[PDB]
Design a protein around this ligand. Structure first.
Ligand SMILES: [Cl-]
Ligand SMILES: [Cl-]
Ligand SMILES: [Mg+2]
Ligand SMILES: [Mg+2]
Ligand SMILES: [Mg+2]
Ligand SMILES: [Mg+2]
Lengths: 403, 403
């Protein structure tokens, strides 16, 4: 029995906001879990500390699945990004604890190593095509096997994924949401040239990816996928908002460009139709926003029955605690596809010391017991919360749209 | 142009917790909206005051749909009970303001009166069948045209909906979740007798309802629905958890007992398959938990294409502000089915003075401009927040289950 004696929520902003749950057991074994929900951080803080945490106290930390079900079913209102992110933080901390008790890295509990390391993709961006390709050349030189390309839309002042930051992209940049303007036509007429040029310069062995970031309708995404077929993308991501899962049927009927979706998904139900009808090739859902290792492991098993591989999201708003958890998960499944890896700031790496390392285009979680990560509370305390929002996006006529 | 100059979240516990948003405009017109999420109340408080509210300041309150879209899309993570309940509060308050500007009750803006009043059901319960039926007789003498019946399960210490409270049921009763134990078989073998007896005593004109409260599988619910056909129930509610909406296909194939579901639903997507395959007869989703009048009006329109009527949830954890908004909505649609009405405490009614009245089995929202409800802030401040959780439920072997 590993009785839980304390559970605390820590908020810090070492370059951007992160929320972390730290659980302590009676004999001093601790675990951490990430609870960061970009642009709505404090709602999760409250969901944990005002509501979930009081029920953790006195529970046996060994009971991972029962605690998971207790919170998932016990909340009454079911799922949603706030609830599932809070649950993720508990789940990650409990797996961390399990590994420490077992004297083993978490991946050893989930099936053991299925690969030598975890292949990542990097984030090339620029205002013009030549700018983006110059960045991609850099990522290839740095040993990346896979690279996402995003580029400015001619005739629009701003677009998703293009900024002054080059090893990462940090869009939550203002204390009220930054407003953008969008034209779908300007984008559809321009973005295929990016991938034509990329293949001319970079060749055909490197994997190339693209995030549409929710801006198309299915018949538009069908067209974009066809236009991109000649360049053999690894995936085309989040092409259309996915609440209507049948929306992907039209895409799938018209293009063979592989499809990815799901960084925002909170539970299996957000992907069930997509997976069961073979409408996607990669599921982007994460241990952070879809309810932890416990839940993502179940989802991955279901995905593997339908040729779906994992392509976990990995933007900066997933802390090093999520990255550790994601790497243990990624190491231990047959149907791993790719792992996104945006670099954290040096201050973030200092606040969350961790065992995972990057070499030759792959991450590896290390072999420390548990997750192989912790939070330095003293350093965390030196970086207070700073309100910061994700941007919003409107059409040319002012219509509220999807960023 | 009606500039928003202030927006405050007020938390009060006049017999149970309620959260309320109050929006003030430049020239003094105010609106209120309910934001209460039973057992997770403080998470919505934070989602509103730490994240949404800062964007409300300076906006034109007339722009109801644009503000709705701004929050729904702008949060990035989409939907979920916390986000959609926060959004409902904003939406209710904006409609309140709109009615006030227009000098009309809200139902007059949504289509006008479609009926003389809003028919409700009440809440008969007791430990034995005789006790439950005597309660029903009381409600029938009070002029209720529809009555829900819940009764103790022989051989179980407790069950859903049975307590010492008789005009309402207030299950969030402890500062940690109260634990219950469940046997499906004991319930399936016993509950039809309640409705057999009810028809012998009450007759056939009164509408009789039952809330299964998430405790069956589809084939079990199919059986219960068949067993209850002789008694012609108005609806059989929440028979199975509904994340897998295709679960209702088996129930529908086997029984003609009418089905209701959805008090917990946060958005149209939670009901889309249920509605489009004609799997239910009544949608239970509310202006509070499914994103306001704006969203529920759209959902009701979709429902009406598939013979689905509204049966909004109306338990105590929906404040009088929700009930006002629910009644304006209920008055103004063709496909109204029934409105649930649990009584609030006298203290709750005093904190939330309201125009709506009850007579001859119907509620009517009144004819004041706006919603016809307000919050008395001075009185609200006399009743501080008190943590209180919904109960949890486990099977005989300890398995975490659905309450
Ligand atoms: Cl949620
Ligand atoms: Cl949510
Ligand atoms: Mg910076
Ligand atoms: Mg993305
Ligand atoms: Mg009481
Ligand atoms: Mg119910």
């Amino acid at each position: 029995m590993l009785k839980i004696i304390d559970a605390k929520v820590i908020v810090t902003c070492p370059g951007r906001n992160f929320v972390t749950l730290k659980i302590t057991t009676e004999d001093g074994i601790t675990g951490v879990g990430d609870a960061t929900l970009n642009g709505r951080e404090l709602s999760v803080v409250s969901f944990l500390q005002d509501h979930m945490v009081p029920s953790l106290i006195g529970r046996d930390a060994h009971q991972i699945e029962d605690i998971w079900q207790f919170f998932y079913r016990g909340s009454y209102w079911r799922g949603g990004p706030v609830a599932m992110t809070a649950l993720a933080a508990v789940d990650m901390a409990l797996w961390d604890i399990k590994g420490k008790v077992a004297g083993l890295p978490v991946y050893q509990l989930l099936g053991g190593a299925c690969r030598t390391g975890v292949t990542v993709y990097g984030h090339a961006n620029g205002e013009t095509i030549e700018d983006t390709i110059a960045e991609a050349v850099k990522y290839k030189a740095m040993g990346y096997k896979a690279i996402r390309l995003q580029t400015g839309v001619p005739g629009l002042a701003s677009t998703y994924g293009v900024s002054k930051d080059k090893m990462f992209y940090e869009p939550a940049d203002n204390d009220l949401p930054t407003e953008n303007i969008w034209s779908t036509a300007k984008y559809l007429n321009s973005v295929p040239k990016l991938f034509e040029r990329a293949r001319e310069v970079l060749g055909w062995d490197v994997h190339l990816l693209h995030d549409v970031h929710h801006r198309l309708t299915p018949i538009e995404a069908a067209r974009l996928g066809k236009d991109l077929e000649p360049y053999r993308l690894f995936w085309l991501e989040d092409s259309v908002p996915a609440e209507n899962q049948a929306g992907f049927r039209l895409i799938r009927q018209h293009t063979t460009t592989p499809l990815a979706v799901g960084e925002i998904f909170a539970h299996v139900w957000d992907a069930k139709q997509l997976i069961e009808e073979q409408l996607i090739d990669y599921l982007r859902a994460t241990v952070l926003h879809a309810g932890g290792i416990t839940n993502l492991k179940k989802i991955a098993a279901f995905a593997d029955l339908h040729h779906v591989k994992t392509g976990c999201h990995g933007a900066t708003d997933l802390s090093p605690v999520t990255m550790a958890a994601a790497l243990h998960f990624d190491m231990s499944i047959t149907n791993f596809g790719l792992q996104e890896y945006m670099r954290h700031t040096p201050e973030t790496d200092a606040v969350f010391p961790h065992a995972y390392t990057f070499s030759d285009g792959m991450l590896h979680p290390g072999d420390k017991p548990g997750l192989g990560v912790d939070i330095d509370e003293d350093l965390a305390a030196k970086h207070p919360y700073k309100r910061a929002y994700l941007p919003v996006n409107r059409l040319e006529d002012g219509t509220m749209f999807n960023w």
